[model samples]
Target: SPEERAQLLTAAEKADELGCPEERAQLLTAAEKADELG
Candidate 1:
């Protein structure tokens, strides 16, 4: 859990630089939603 938390911290930093919203909350959750399902 601790390691995962650190990973998310960096993920958030990069997402902010790349301009994601607090609402969608995280990057790449929709990364391959359709393709993965397909």
Candidate 2:
């Protein structure tokens, strides 16, 4: 469920920008996927 996971991450990314989580799931997902694909 990458779309579902991505959707959740989209929200989490916003939360990070707000300085709450201080981390973005969506951004992290990009890096994570690169490694997985490679």
Candidate 3:
């Protein structure tokens, strides 16, 4: 799902911007998982 991919990517960016390393990592991990699943 492109939306999920985009959402995760966006969320990851936001997390990074907010200085939330852990959340960014999780979002990126989830994005990778989505890429695999898709």
Candidate 4:
């Protein structure tokens, strides 16, 4: 799921730039989870 994690991390970065802390955190968490699964 590395690709999924990458997408999630990319989204997280975008969320941070957009000032969406909640979404950023969620995306970061999802990325971590995907990494774990991968």
Candidate 5:
């Protein structure tokens, strides 16, 4: 859902704000995750 995506984006924002190496973190597209759920 949109909430999950926003949560992940928020995490990334924190990482970027902290200047961490893991700031490159990213989430898969909605279709991608849905595929795995199936």
Candidate 6:
């Protein structure tokens, strides 16, 4: 679970870099699409 948590934290950091919650949500949605399909 460490790797998965690290990955999520990295994703959130990238989301934070976008500087807006909407942008973060958009990016997070897109980022999670792979999982949705999986």
Candidate of highest lDDT = 4
Model 2 off-target regions past 4 Å? 20-38
Predictions ranked by TM-score, top down?
4, 3, 5, 1, 6, 2
Using all chains and alpha carbons, the TM-scores for the candidates as numbered come to 0.47, 0.40, 0.68, 0.72, 0.51, 0.47
Candidates in order: C-alpha RMSD to true structure: 8.5, 5.0, 1.3, 1.1, 5.2, 4.8
* Per-prediction tally of clashes: 0, 0, 0, 0, 0, 0
Query: What are the per-residue Cα lDDT tens digits for candidate 2 across 4-32?
Result: 55655566666666765445655556545
Candidate 6, 5-34: lDDT as tens digits: 556556866888868797677667655653
Error of 1 at 6 (Å): 0.8
Model 4, residue 15: C-alpha shift (Å): 1.2
Cα lDDT tens digits for candidate 1, 1-38: 44555555566667768786862365434323323444
lDDT of 4 by residue, 1-38 (tens): 89998987788778878998778889878878888988
- Give me the runs in candidate 5 sitting further than 4 Å from their true place: 26-38
What residue pairs are clashing in model 5?
none
The window of 10 residues in a row where model 2 has the poorest summed lDDT is 26-35
Model 5 weakest lDDT span, ten residues long: 26-35
Better structure of 2 and 5 per lDDT:
2
Off by over 4 Å in 3: none
Tell me how far the alpha carbon of residue 10 in candidate 1 is from the true structure, in angstroms, after superposition. Answer: 0.5
- Give the lDDT ranking, best first: 4, 3, 6, 2, 5, 1
Candidate 3 matches the true fold with a TM-score of: 0.68
